[PDB]
């Protein structure tokens, strides 16, 4: 097995500014050469060590023939730095931002964020981690040896053409169920192998698939100890037998290495439309851990951090967002899927869900024009994305109850809100799981309703607006996303 | 919107459910037609995008014994054959 790659950790130079170049180039998957992209690389980019309260500047240089963005997924920073409208870097271009970090130590990432292009630009290889350190977490004595017992694990699926090149297509099927493939890339590698000390192994897991949700576990069923979520540490470690992770979410887990017993990290088959076709019908290996006589470094504390109380939940401005996949898109996408893969497709959510004759006929009558441009078929609140109108203005420094509905379709909708770390009160109609009570920047929405308590501490204008979107990328690209603004009330 | 005149046999099928007019809008035909199918059991209880008209008057109208309420443009072309568009 090939040895797992470790993204270069990236602090500042004499001038506290990090340099990131957005290039293309070549990578090799199972001996077939493909064209891939990357931040300071052929592939996937680096880990940007940031230090809370101490700011740094980032020059972003774009050596693609085409344009792209750079979203700091998980950061509490003004809508300026994201950019939004005219936050676009044109080919050969420069952009410079400053990141004054103010949020607890956390494992965030960055990825291209342009409505219409995110799906493909990500699929190409653009990704990259941000590692935030505060003083609290250093005083903690977690495993700290980057690339040894503290390991980024970026897990992604891709599909490849006959050529060995990446095969993306934003057709009506991938706009419906997502772009998903058959080859699983752990930090870019296929089934790599990592060499761990005996002791605790810290793994910063990141689901970077386009639509594929993952569900981590170990080949031999040792528990994973979750110690942090999207936005930072949990209060105490949550012991779990399996860890489902959605697109763009991160969890830092600890695992125990004792004997020379090797064992794989695996992702278990998941109850999601189109994600339990072979080879993901069965448990699938993410990477193999092999223990050797390397130095260990950390412990599994019984407390990790303090977490503030929640403010009384009335008086709080409340906003309902209702996600909606245009029903024609659903019917059609599922036809493409039910043809291509037999009925091994819907396996996992395959049961009594049906659709009446009256619904079918009302669908017929409704697109009498035969005008069905599926590039706006996904909507929040009834209308798809238009950069022109931020949907609303929410208050700075103020607590608010956002309620995201997803009733009417059974399509997974991991829902992302920029410029904040928030807390989940309801996640798809149930109270959040023990480890998703933390800080999160993504919420499951699958046929039901979630409610999050959110507060933005950073200004964002119509010019550079915050977003909110499904992080199933092909949904975000085909309309399921809005903008919003935040300013200190006049 | 769009206003139309049902050719004879379609008009016949249209009044079997309670229509009375001689010149309808499109949404009006779609309504009464779906009403006809759901009154005469014509869909299959299990797969109910599937309409079985072989032995019915609708079978002669459309010229088939079956069709699927998913193939929209096809069912529209069958509908428009028995129409005279007035605009």
Residue numbers in the entry:
A (entry chain A): 31 to 520
B (entry chain B): 25 to 111
Source paper text:
To gain further mechanistic insights, we determined crystal structures of both the free and MDM2(6–125)-bound forms of CueO-PM2 along with CueO-12.1. The asymmetric unit for the MDM2-bound form comprised a single binary complex with the scaffolded PM2 peptide adopting its prototypical α-helical conformation. The three key signature residues (Phe, Trp, and Leu) projecting from the outer face of the helix are accommodated by discrete pockets in a prolonged hydrophobic cleft of MDM2. Comparison with structures of unscaffolded PMI, a related stapled derivate (MO6, differing by one amino acid), and the parental p53 peptide bound to MDM2 (32, 36, 41) shows highly similar side chain conformations of these residues. The adjacent MRS residues Met-396 and Asn-397 extend the PM2 α-helix to more fully occupy the MDM2 binding groove. The PM2 conformation is further stabilized by hydrophobic interactions between residues on its inner face (Leu-393 and Tyr-390) and Ile-358 and Met-361 on the α5 helix. In addition to a polar contact between side chains of Lys-94 of MDM2 and Gln-365 in the α5 helix, these interactions likely drive ordering of the MRS linker residues abutting PM2 that are highly mobile in native CueO. The MDM2-bound PM2 helix is positioned well away from the sCu and T1 copper-binding sites, permitting unhindered access to Cu and syringaldazine substrates and resulting in the observed MDM2-dependent activity gains. The structure of MDM2 bound to CueO-PM2 showed clear dislocation of the PM2 insert away from the sCu and T1 copper-binding sites, rescuing enzymatic activity. In the case of CueO-PM2, co-incubation with MDM2 resulted in ∼1.6-fold increased kcat (and no change in Km).
